[PDB]
Amino acid sequence: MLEQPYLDLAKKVLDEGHFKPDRTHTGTYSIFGHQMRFDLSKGFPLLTTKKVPFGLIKSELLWFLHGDTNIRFLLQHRNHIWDEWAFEKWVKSDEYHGPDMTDFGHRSQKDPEFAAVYHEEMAKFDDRVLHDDAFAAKYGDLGLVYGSQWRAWHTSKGDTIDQLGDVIEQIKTHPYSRRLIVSAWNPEDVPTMALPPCHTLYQFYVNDGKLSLQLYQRSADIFLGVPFNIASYALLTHLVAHECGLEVGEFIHTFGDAHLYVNHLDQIKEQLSRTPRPAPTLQLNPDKHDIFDFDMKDIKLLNYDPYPAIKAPVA
Amino acid sequence: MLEQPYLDLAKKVLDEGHFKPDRTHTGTYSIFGHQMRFDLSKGFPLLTTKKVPFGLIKSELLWFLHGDTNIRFLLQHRNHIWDEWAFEKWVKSDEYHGPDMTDFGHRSQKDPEFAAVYHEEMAKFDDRVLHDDAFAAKYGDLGLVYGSQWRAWHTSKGDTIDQLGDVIEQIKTHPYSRRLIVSAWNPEDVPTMALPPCHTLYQFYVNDGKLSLQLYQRSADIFLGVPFNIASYALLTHLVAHECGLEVGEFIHTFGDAHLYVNHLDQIKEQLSRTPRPAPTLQLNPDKHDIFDFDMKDIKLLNYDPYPAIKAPVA
Ligand SMILES: Nc1nc(=O)c2c([nH]1)N=C[C@H](CNc1ccc(C(=O)N[C@@H](CCC(=O)O)C(=O)O)cc1)N2CO
Ligand SMILES: Nc1nc(=O)c2c([nH]1)N=C[C@H](CNc1ccc(C(=O)N[C@@H](CCC(=O)O)C(=O)O)cc1)N2CO
Ligand SMILES: O=c1[nH]c(=O)n(C2C[C@H](O)[C@@H](COP(=O)(O)O)O2)cc1F
Ligand SMILES: O=c1[nH]c(=O)n(C2C[C@H](O)[C@@H](COP(=O)(O)O)O2)cc1F
Incomplete structure (x- = not known):
């Protein structure tokens, strides 16, 4: 099934998962180093084993996409x-x-x-x-949140870098480059920061006319945080694929500390006794191609039929 | 055996490897998204299936480590x-x-x-x-090369960031943080640059008293370039593990475009008909603990006995 890299991730945090001390210290089972892979041509990667609101996914991603803060x-x-x-x-x-x-x-x-x-x-x-x-x-x-990292990086001699807009030039100008990266990791700003970006780095890649995207996430919340994270960058991968007139390949999710808080332990097991249903599909407005000038209703999800949602404490 | 994640990588570039156009265009079999894992507690990760000069590894890494350019x-x-x-x-x-x-x-x-x-x-x-x-x-x-990224990042209002030295404070101050990253990806500098860093990002991680390190490399040369890359950051992981008085866990190597140039095709197959021999081990000076004030002879490799080297064209 499609969201099965994920279910397996949670199974593995439980089985090989080391017990950690942590910043939010409730406690955490953590693994270090973990890669997952999702073929987006077999469906949109949002979870059918629990009601995830795709509506918060879209509005958070288009905020970012307008370069808003x-x-x-x-x-x-x-x-x-x-x-x-x-x-x-x-x-x-x-x-x-x-x-x-x-x-x-x-x-x-x-x-x-x-x-x-x-x-x-x-x-x-x-x-x-x-x-x-x-x-x-x-x-x-x-201030510094993802919309001003992607789209307006501050330079040492006054300017701003729209790095997203320039990489989208780069895929249109030169599909086959190995330098296609957007980074939210900014050295000077990180010891001040509130949250230093959890989604550090990403790299797009073209091959044979379809693009893939790879994500480095330094810390991950396996239960509450990863399901959502999976759908933001895979909607971004169909959006950018839409603007350069390119097909869709895979979303690759590389992780660094993947961690299960222990008070989610009982909930993670519940959804693990659920059986995935078929994937949702994504429809984008076929007229409008400047994704930066997209709004809400241009992105659409067809036939998403989840299991019930599993509310569980953390915020 | 220890360098078998690697041999397998080359086998996979060959078997699922898509044919690419590329910047150096000789041509390239490439995959997108690939993670390998090396337990450094079972031996130092340099290749026994071909004479790799560990001497160029050490001097390049201590250059970096002194913050030299x-x-x-x-x-x-x-x-x-x-x-x-x-x-x-x-x-x-x-x-x-x-x-x-x-x-x-x-x-x-x-x-x-x-x-x-x-x-x-x-x-x-x-x-x-x-x-x-x-x-x-x-x-x-x-100029901008890895020693001035790790150790002297230029800030928008005049200063320099030793980010390596501050993360090494961070592992000593707080083992268990999820923000432990060093990045060579600097947005403004990358469209000027000569080579934009191939080794984009790294994250250290502690668990149970042993540290792991994870590496994001945006482009990789499978035959000529990856073997060396494997030993630089795994020597860095035993060095930093040495300075914080910590054991050694794993080196995790995440890749983005991993690629085999096609004129190395015949050579990659040769070493793939070789049988790995036992791993080399690493000895560090046990007195000297400020790795930034390390020289050559402090790092040592014990019993590295390779197969012969496979010279093959590229530079
Ligand atoms: N104050 C704060 N706390 C945070 O948890 C938080 C934040 N800021 N900054 C961004 C991220 C986002 N983290 C979140 C953690 C969980 C849910 C969540 O559980 N989603 C629910 C909705 C439930 C609800 O909010 O009551 C879902 O199941 O749909 C939302 C955001 N994050 C990390 O520092
Ligand atoms: N001009 C230049 N060309 C490059 O190949 C190069 C460079 N700069 N900048 C840094 C990296 C390093 N790339 C290298 C590529 C291969 C070997 C190599 O094959 N090592 C040999 C030694 C053989 C020799 O050099 O004759 C080994 O087998 O030990 C060395 C460096 N790189 C990428 O832009
Ligand atoms: O969307 C989310 N993404 C995310 O990365 N976290 C996490 C994971 C971890 O629990 C914390 C960040 O911790 P640190 O600041 O030490 O990385 O917030 C939470 C969310 F809900
Ligand atoms: O030590 C090395 N590391 C490395 O990353 N390359 C590569 C891989 C690729 O062939 C090129 C970088 O290409 P680009 O500038 O498009 O990333 O140099 C070569 C070496 F020898």
Whole structure:
């Protein structure tokens, strides 16, 4: 079946998985070094063994693709995955007075009955970055996030590098190059950073008219984080394949620390007793070819019929 | 046997290998996406199926390790691997007059009886960058090469980043981090560059007191280039393992375009009819622990007994 490299990954984290200490320390079974391979010509790689929302996949990827850094497109697209970083830095200094989130995520994860303050204060904040322009401009611009790595790398003598747009020139100009890489790993910025990019590096590759893409992810969340990660870069591989007028080959997912938090252990086993169903397929707008000027409804998924979703604690 | 991930790689480039057009176009059988794994606790990974000079491995790696960019340490260490870049840019503009190398490598590869000019002119040039300081300073400093990526990354507001030295702090400070990466991929510099780094990215990892290292190499030369590449980063993994007082785990070699030039085809088959012999072992100086202040004779290889070497055309 198609998402079986994955199910196997989770089986292997469990079976050869070493027990780790870690930054978020709940604990983690981890392996080091792991490659998976998905043929995208046999179907779109989103998981049929659990309801994954493809809608959050698309809006997060087109944010990136527009080179955006503002949490407002995302909220304005019902998409909240990145709120806690900009909210982390709204709790910042000035302006903010009242109540008091003095490291919050983990605290409503060793939960109070207070969670409603946290979320009636978050709904105050998500309203302001999409009503107030001023607000949004200073408290919604995450800064360095993936849209400004791919599409606007800052140079030592003032400029910005759209590296994505230049590689897309490079596949159209010279299919057969071995230098086709986009990197979010920026040395000076990484000891400051909040999250140093989990999806470090990628390389496209052409052969015989179909492109493959390979991904290096330095840390991975096997249960909650990898399923989503699999569909972002494989939608990006059909999108770029669409713009250069090229077919689709494989998505190769190389990992560095792949890890199962141990409180997901019972959930990972459940979905492992499920049987994969046939893959979903992807339909893109066949008129519109500048993917950078794509919106939501241009990307479409046909017949995705999942098993039920497995909610399990982590955020 | 230990170097068998490799032999298998070459077998697979041959068997599933797609035929490519390429930059150096002689031609190439290429695969896309390939991971190999070497347990360094069962022996040092240099090839017993052909005499690989470990002496060029060590001097190239300690150049890097001192953060050097000058071709003189290397020559002064009988090591010529990088001459053609600095010589390429001695043929540059001014100074150089006489004879005339108007893209040379490939020309004494579609050979004249002229090769002696090329090399009596190269022996003029290797003499000057190690007698003349002035010479060496402007025509030997390659610039951006791996020693100035690892150890002195230039920042947008004036400074330099020793990223290697800071990760080595990070393994000593916090073994268990998932952010332990060194990258030679620098966006602004890559469309200028001569060779954009073939060895893009690496990530160290600790588990249970032994470190692993994972490597992303965007393009690879399977026959002439990969055997050497395997031993540089696996010597680096025993060196760093030595400095943090840590054991040695595995070297993981992830690849992007792995490719066999077709004129090496007959040679790759020859060594594939050879039988691997037991692995070589590595001895490091047990007093000296600052690997950055290592020289040659501190690194040692015990009982490396190869098959004969397979010279085959490419440079
Ligand atoms: N504050 C923060 N915490 C994070 O978990 C997080 C973040 N920022 N920055 C980006 C990533 C994204 N991580 C996430 C972790 C899990 C889910 C998740 O479980 N998805 C659910 C939805 C459930 C929900 O959010 O309640 C799914 O099953 O669909 C979302 C984002 N990440 C890492 O530092
Ligand atoms: N001009 C140039 N050409 C290159 O081949 C080269 C270079 N620069 N820059 C760095 C790398 C290194 N590539 C090399 C390719 C092969 C051998 C090699 O075959 N090693 C031999 C020694 C034989 C000899 O050199 O005559 C061995 O078997 O030991 C050396 C370096 N590389 C890529 O652009
Ligand atoms: O989409 C996601 N991608 C991802 O990489 N993580 C992870 C994995 C790991 O648990 C953490 C990053 O840890 P570190 O900062 O030490 O890499 O967030 C979480 C997500 F939900
Ligand atoms: O040590 C070596 N490492 C290496 O990466 N190459 C290669 C592989 C490929 O043939 C070329 C780089 O091509 P490109 O510039 O298109 O990546 O040099 C050659 C060597 F000898």
